[PDB]
């Protein structure tokens, strides 16, 4: 599962 990265 991907790590969250905000935009």
């Amino acid at each position, epitope marked *: *599962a*991907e*790590f*969250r*990265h*905000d*935009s």
Partner: antibody
Amino acid sequence: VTLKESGPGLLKPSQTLSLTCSFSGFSIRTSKVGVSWIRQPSGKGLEWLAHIYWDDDKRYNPSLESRLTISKDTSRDMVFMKITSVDTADTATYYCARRGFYGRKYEVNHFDYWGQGTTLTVSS
Amino acid sequence: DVLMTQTPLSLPVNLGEQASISCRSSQSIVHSNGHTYLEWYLQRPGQSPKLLIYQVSTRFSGVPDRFSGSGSGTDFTLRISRVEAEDLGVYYCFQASLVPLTFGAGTKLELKR
């Protein structure tokens, strides 16, 4: 920007580890940086444990996740870690690492600052 | 999980020589957002780890241009063009695309004799 970890130094097996990371030179609230805990067990390399985002969303390393609880206090500018049921293998240096970013480019983030760490030795 | 395999694990060098460390991920670490969260960290003896390179090839502020990162997908290389005494220590590659975030085992760049 400085990061300062605090922890008990020594614990007996089965106790709960409570760590604190305190930040200076900036505001967790304003910056919205994510924060991780990483450890370095005796004679090994680095291992990521847990991460907490500005909105209290959290991610853990499955290898230890069941024993870990990360939290934060924005009013105090601090991030915390609890590790339950400590044993010999938790003997390590515990690092606080800030996931800072370039400007307002939230997506261009990386561990830009690390604390000096706090060492724990677990023994009966 | 993403295994991060560094080669070699031990790298003796003479100061002034070039050095190269390979890092292979066990699967693509290209994130869906389009970035490849490949980072290099250096831990000098008796010191905290520090950021050298992020997004494969971008030097962090204050990191000198003798360091260069390259590669893509699963295949990554850190080069150091003329090794100085301050460069010695343990180098870790690191992926922050998939959970758990994983480090390589560490490559110990040391003074050769």
